[PDB]
Design a protein around this motif. Structure first.
Motif, PDB file in Angstrom:
ATOM      1  N   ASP A   1      26.576  32.425  40.252  1.00  0.00           N
ATOM      2  CA  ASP A   1      27.991  32.590  40.584  1.00  0.00           C
ATOM      3  C   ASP A   1      28.143  32.751  42.092  1.00  0.00           C
ATOM      4  OD1 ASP A   1      30.705  33.204  40.899  1.00  0.00           O
ATOM      5  OD2 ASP A   1      30.644  35.035  39.698  1.00  0.00           O
ATOM      6  N   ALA A   2      28.982  31.894  42.678  1.00  0.00           N
ATOM      7  CA  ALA A   2      29.161  31.818  44.127  1.00  0.00           C
ATOM      8  C   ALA A   2      29.954  33.008  44.665  1.00  0.00           C
ATOM      9  CB  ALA A   2      29.841  30.510  44.500  1.00  0.00           C
ATOM     10  N   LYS A   3      30.744  33.627  43.789  1.00  0.00           N
ATOM     11  CA  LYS A   3      31.602  34.769  44.156  1.00  0.00           C
ATOM     12  C   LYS A   3      30.822  36.049  44.556  1.00  0.00           C
ATOM     13  CE  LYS A   3      34.219  35.075  40.515  1.00  0.00           C
ATOM     14  NZ  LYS A   3      33.380  34.250  39.602  1.00  0.00           N
ATOM     15  N   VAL A   4      29.548  36.113  44.201  1.00  0.00           N
ATOM     16  CA  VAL A   4      28.667  37.203  44.602  1.00  0.00           C
ATOM     17  C   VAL A   4      28.524  37.285  46.148  1.00  0.00           C
ATOM     18  CG1 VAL A   4      26.319  38.116  44.427  1.00  0.00           C
ATOM     19  CG2 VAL A   4      27.485  37.313  42.372  1.00  0.00           C
ATOM     20  N   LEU A   5      28.911  36.207  46.834  1.00  0.00           N
ATOM     21  CA  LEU A   5      29.089  36.195  48.290  1.00  0.00           C
ATOM     22  C   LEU A   5      30.015  37.331  48.745  1.00  0.00           C
ATOM     23  CD1 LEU A   5      28.834  34.802  51.119  1.00  0.00           C
ATOM     24  CD2 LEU A   5      30.700  33.292  50.405  1.00  0.00           C
ATOM     25  N   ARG A   6      31.084  37.545  47.984  1.00  0.00           N
ATOM     26  CA  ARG A   6      32.102  38.544  48.266  1.00  0.00           C
ATOM     27  C   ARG A   6      31.695  39.967  47.897  1.00  0.00           C
ATOM     28  NH1 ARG A   6      34.992  36.427  52.145  1.00  0.00           N
ATOM     29  NH2 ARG A   6      34.523  34.188  51.931  1.00  0.00           N
ATOM     30  N   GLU A   7      30.535  40.126  47.268  1.00  0.00           N
ATOM     31  CA  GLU A   7      29.973  41.453  47.026  1.00  0.00           C
ATOM     32  C   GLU A   7      28.894  41.736  48.074  1.00  0.00           C
ATOM     33  OE1 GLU A   7      28.515  42.143  43.034  1.00  0.00           O
ATOM     34  OE2 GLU A   7      26.702  43.168  43.700  1.00  0.00           O
TER      35      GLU A   7
ATOM     36  N   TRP B   1      35.456  45.516  45.343  1.00  0.00           N
ATOM     37  CA  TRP B   1      36.389  46.533  45.830  1.00  0.00           C
ATOM     38  C   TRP B   1      35.625  47.765  46.331  1.00  0.00           C
ATOM     39  CZ3 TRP B   1      36.577  51.167  43.063  1.00  0.00           C
ATOM     40  CH2 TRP B   1      37.480  52.120  43.549  1.00  0.00           C
ATOM     41  N   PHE B   2      34.575  48.164  45.611  1.00  0.00           N
ATOM     42  CA  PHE B   2      33.908  49.424  45.958  1.00  0.00           C
ATOM     43  C   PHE B   2      33.196  49.387  47.322  1.00  0.00           C
ATOM     44  CE2 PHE B   2      30.856  52.995  45.685  1.00  0.00           C
ATOM     45  CZ  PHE B   2      31.772  54.031  45.554  1.00  0.00           C
ATOM     46  N   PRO B   3      32.354  48.362  47.589  1.00  0.00           N
ATOM     47  CA  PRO B   3      31.801  48.293  48.971  1.00  0.00           C
ATOM     48  C   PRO B   3      32.839  48.130  50.086  1.00  0.00           C
ATOM     49  CG  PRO B   3      31.099  46.414  47.610  1.00  0.00           C
ATOM     50  CD  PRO B   3      31.625  47.460  46.669  1.00  0.00           C
ATOM     51  N   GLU B   4      33.939  47.422  49.808  1.00  0.00           N
ATOM     52  CA  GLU B   4      35.027  47.322  50.770  1.00  0.00           C
ATOM     53  C   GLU B   4      35.617  48.727  51.046  1.00  0.00           C
ATOM     54  OE1 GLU B   4      36.177  44.480  52.375  1.00  0.00           O
ATOM     55  OE2 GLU B   4      35.897  42.768  51.031  1.00  0.00           O
ATOM     56  N   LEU B   5      35.730  49.564  49.997  1.00  0.00           N
ATOM     57  CA  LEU B   5      36.257  50.922  50.164  1.00  0.00           C
ATOM     58  C   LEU B   5      35.316  51.745  51.049  1.00  0.00           C
ATOM     59  CD1 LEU B   5      37.793  53.692  49.591  1.00  0.00           C
ATOM     60  CD2 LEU B   5      36.937  53.531  47.247  1.00  0.00           C
ATOM     61  N   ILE B   6      34.020  51.659  50.780  1.00  0.00           N
ATOM     62  CA  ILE B   6      33.051  52.438  51.550  1.00  0.00           C
ATOM     63  C   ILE B   6      32.994  51.976  53.014  1.00  0.00           C
ATOM     64  CG2 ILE B   6      30.635  53.083  51.807  1.00  0.00           C
ATOM     65  CD1 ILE B   6      32.175  54.522  49.542  1.00  0.00           C
TER      66      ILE B   6
ATOM     67  N   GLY C   1      44.220  40.569  67.278  1.00  0.00           N
ATOM     68  CA  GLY C   1      44.784  39.383  66.681  1.00  0.00           C
ATOM     69  C   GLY C   1      44.061  39.060  65.395  1.00  0.00           C
ATOM     70  N   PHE C   2      44.805  39.087  64.296  1.00  0.00           N
ATOM     71  CA  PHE C   2      44.242  38.801  62.979  1.00  0.00           C
ATOM     72  C   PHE C   2      44.514  37.356  62.593  1.00  0.00           C
ATOM     73  CE2 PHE C   2      44.786  38.423  58.357  1.00  0.00           C
ATOM     74  CZ  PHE C   2      43.567  38.905  57.903  1.00  0.00           C
ATOM     75  N   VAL C   3      43.462  36.637  62.216  1.00  0.00           N
ATOM     76  CA  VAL C   3      43.611  35.328  61.602  1.00  0.00           C
ATOM     77  C   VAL C   3      43.154  35.320  60.122  1.00  0.00           C
ATOM     78  CG1 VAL C   3      41.458  34.526  62.722  1.00  0.00           C
ATOM     79  CG2 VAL C   3      43.107  32.857  61.801  1.00  0.00           C
ATOM     80  N   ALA C   4      44.082  34.971  59.226  1.00  0.00           N
ATOM     81  CA  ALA C   4      43.886  35.041  57.775  1.00  0.00           C
ATOM     82  C   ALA C   4      42.988  33.967  57.173  1.00  0.00           C
ATOM     83  CB  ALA C   4      45.236  35.025  57.069  1.00  0.00           C
ATOM     84  N   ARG C   5      41.680  34.126  57.308  1.00  0.00           N
ATOM     85  CA  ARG C   5      40.724  33.218  56.663  1.00  0.00           C
ATOM     86  C   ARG C   5      40.737  33.455  55.151  1.00  0.00           C
ATOM     87  NH1 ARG C   5      40.824  29.584  60.377  1.00  0.00           N
ATOM     88  NH2 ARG C   5      39.334  29.745  62.116  1.00  0.00           N
ATOM     89  N   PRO C   6      40.316  32.453  54.343  1.00  0.00           N
ATOM     90  CA  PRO C   6      40.268  32.638  52.882  1.00  0.00           C
ATOM     91  C   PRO C   6      39.565  33.940  52.471  1.00  0.00           C
ATOM     92  CG  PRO C   6      39.747  30.372  53.421  1.00  0.00           C
ATOM     93  CD  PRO C   6      39.856  31.103  54.730  1.00  0.00           C
ATOM     94  N   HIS C   7      40.157  34.672  51.527  1.00  0.00           N
ATOM     95  CA  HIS C   7      39.607  35.943  51.025  1.00  0.00           C
ATOM     96  C   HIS C   7      39.626  37.050  52.097  1.00  0.00           C
ATOM     97  CE1 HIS C   7      37.613  36.988  47.058  1.00  0.00           C
ATOM     98  NE2 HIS C   7      37.453  38.119  47.722  1.00  0.00           N
TER      99      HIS C   7
ATOM    100  N   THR D   1      31.828  30.626  53.732  1.00  0.00           N
ATOM    101  CA  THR D   1      31.736  30.055  52.376  1.00  0.00           C
ATOM    102  C   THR D   1      30.688  28.951  52.286  1.00  0.00           C
ATOM    103  OG1 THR D   1      33.478  28.377  52.583  1.00  0.00           O
ATOM    104  CG2 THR D   1      34.178  30.601  51.964  1.00  0.00           C
ATOM    105  N   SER D   2      30.225  28.459  53.436  1.00  0.00           N
ATOM    106  CA  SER D   2      29.117  27.509  53.478  1.00  0.00           C
ATOM    107  C   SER D   2      27.859  28.100  52.845  1.00  0.00           C
ATOM    108  CB  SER D   2      28.844  27.053  54.917  1.00  0.00           C
ATOM    109  OG  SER D   2      28.329  28.107  55.739  1.00  0.00           O
ATOM    110  N   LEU D   3      27.861  29.417  52.643  1.00  0.00           N
ATOM    111  CA  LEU D   3      26.753  30.091  51.975  1.00  0.00           C
ATOM    112  C   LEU D   3      26.860  30.010  50.453  1.00  0.00           C
ATOM    113  CD1 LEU D   3      25.958  31.241  54.850  1.00  0.00           C
ATOM    114  CD2 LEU D   3      25.444  33.395  53.652  1.00  0.00           C
TER     115      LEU D   3
END
Lengths: 224, 226
Positions: B29-35, A36-41, B188-194, B17-19
């Motif tokens: 943890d694969a979710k660190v992709l989203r950070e 959430w925090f990097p998305e906010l920045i 135009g927005f396309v809603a990809r996962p996450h 997500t192929s990453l």
């Protein structure tokens, strides 16, 4: 000295991990704070780049909702309110007041500079009881533009009637120190939890680094 | 029908997500992709705001190293090289070819626009097999300014000899569409996962929304009869 130390507030002085419980609850995962925090920045800078301005806290809430949707998590106005509460009441790192005292003793002037908009009293720093250490509390609101836009730093310098050489920006975010150093200030980096410096070619490194606020203060003092 | 559709490439057309495997191995943890990802975009906009520039893939590696150091995860030149490899070999979402066929057959002109610097052949889009759908493949690289800087969209309009109202930006990121609409384009927005739309007061919403590329193409074909 007549050196002026300019401190980022959120995360640098005040503990952002204090927000964990709100994430652990809404998300089943506290780690989602660090998404959430990097998305906010990111969105603060997007607005600045595109010529738009909303207050930081309104962005914070919007992005909280977006991240919620992304994780498919439910969110009530009560949650937004709790976010407002926690975000405006982050406690100060225990290493802060000791460090500010030593810098005040060695002759430094101390000022804050934040992305957050002015609020009615008490401010987050007043609530944390470290507000009085500082001669001034500046925000990006007068600039209508978020860090690291050059005008935030330039108008700060202007307001304080100082030359870039008299100033050092202190932050745990390399993006904030880079913004200041590009304006000719010195940069001081403090290694908060989950904050290490980014190293990229052609990107200036911090003039000063400290593993905490005490060690950074030493370096700043040592620099005679 | 004479709209030019400008497609964001990473995440929008090619699957980020192929990453995941790389984040699972290095971080546990694969979710660190989203950070790591919003950190990467954040730093690209920081560089642009401060008048600095390095190619996107370089920032990607530096941010990967930093995010590793933040988790105290060990990283070797091996891991970085793999990030480079993965970042330039992302596969196309299965819904992309059908949609691009439909849009082309509807008479739309098709273009890509990416933060990523040009690569030697074959490009990620070429490898993914979809490159041939597009008339042109543009990047921020010559401008040395990343999205959503206004000059990125304006120079795209100029290079294409087009007017803002002729152009529509397609992305799974609201920050990418926001930059374009600010310059007079449609979005135009396309809603990809996450990925879901940021809804914030006084910030323009996308002209068109699809929960996948097919549903977006439905809306674009339905509406952009110009």
């Amino acid at each position: 000295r007549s050196g002026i130390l300019v401190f980022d507030v959120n995360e640098t002085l005040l503990d952002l991990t204090s927000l964990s419980p709100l994430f652990e609850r809404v998300f089943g995962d506290a780690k989602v704070l660090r998404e959430w925090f990097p998305e906010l920045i990111l969105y603060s800078q997007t607005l600045t780049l595109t010529g738009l301005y909303r207050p930081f806290g309104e962005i914070a809430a919007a992005v909280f909702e977006m991240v919620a949707a992304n994780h498919q998590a439910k969110v009530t106005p009560d949650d937004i309110a709790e976010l407002k509460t926690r975000l405006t009441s982050m406690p100060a790192y225990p290493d802060v007041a000791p460090a500010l005292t030593r810098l005040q003793d060695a002759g430094f002037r101390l000022v804050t500079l934040t992305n957050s908009a002015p609020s009615p009293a008490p401010s987050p720093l007043e609530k944390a009881g470290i507000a009085s250490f500082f001669e001034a509390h500046l925000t990006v609101h007068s600039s209508q533009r978020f860090k690291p836009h050059p005008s935030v730093y330039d108008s700060t310098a202007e307001t304080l009637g100082a030359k870039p050489e008299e100033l050092c920006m202190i932050a745990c975010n390399i993006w904030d120190t880079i913004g200041a150093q590009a304006r000719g200030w010195r940069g001081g980096f403090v290694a908060r939890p989950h904050n290490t410096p980014l190293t990229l070619a052609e990107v200036p490194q911090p003039d000063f680094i400290g593993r905490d606020m005490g060690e950074l203060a030493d370096q700043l003092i040592a620099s005679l």
